[PDB]
Amino acid sequence: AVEISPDVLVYKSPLTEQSTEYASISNNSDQTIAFKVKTTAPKFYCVRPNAAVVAPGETIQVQVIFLGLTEEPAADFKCRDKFLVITLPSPYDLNGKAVADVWSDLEAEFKQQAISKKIKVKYL
Numbered sequence: 001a002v003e004i005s006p007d008v009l010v011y012k013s014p015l016t017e018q019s020t021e022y023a024s025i026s027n028n029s030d031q032t033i034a035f036k037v038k039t040t041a042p043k044f045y046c047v048r049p050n051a052a053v054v055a056p057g058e059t060i061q062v063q064v065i066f067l068g069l070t071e072e073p074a075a076d077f078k079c080r081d082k083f084l085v086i087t088l089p090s091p092y093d094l095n096g097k098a099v100a101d102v103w104s105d106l107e108a109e110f111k112q113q114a115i116s117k118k119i120k121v122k123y124l
Contacts, residue, residue, distance in 0.1 A: 001029050002054075002087045004117040009083070011066045012124045015073065023062045023119060025087060027054035034090035034099050034106060037062055041081040044069075051099040053090050073123060081121040086114050 002025065009021040027033045036051040046065040054060050064083065088110045094102055107114070 002027055002033055002115045004085050004087065004115070004119075006119065008120045008122050009064055010122045010124050011079075013072060015066075015069050015123055016071065018066055018068045020063050020065045023064060023083070023085065024059055025054055025062065025085065026059040027056055030056050032056065032090045033087050034103065035060075035085060035087040036099070036103055037064075038084045038086070039081075040083070043067075044081065045083075047083070051103060053094075053099060054087075077123060079121045079123040083119040083121070085117045085119060087116070088114055 004023070004025050006023065009023065011019055011021060023037070025035050032053050032055050034051070034053045037047045039045050039047055044067050046063075046067065048063045048065070049060070052060055086107070088106050090099075090106065092102075
């Protein structure tokens, strides 16, 4: 129906510099969907777009821009950061409002019908 990928975002050393990895949401249903990407570590990543609609048959690629660390972490360190992607039906015209605007009502209505993915992060 709705496909969200990848399972893991892998950021490659030098982890002191910023780099971009990519997620993607494909709507293979026949109705428009809306999605929201939530970041557990907002000080270290910029997500763009962090909320949007996906028309039937469309794929939206989401840039996850890692801003970097002050020092290279230990080789054994396990990054615990995560990104939760939530997708919902979006059957109403937004009337020019943004998805982040209506997301409150949208989720309040269809939260039971949500399709979500927890995307992990791995430091390499």
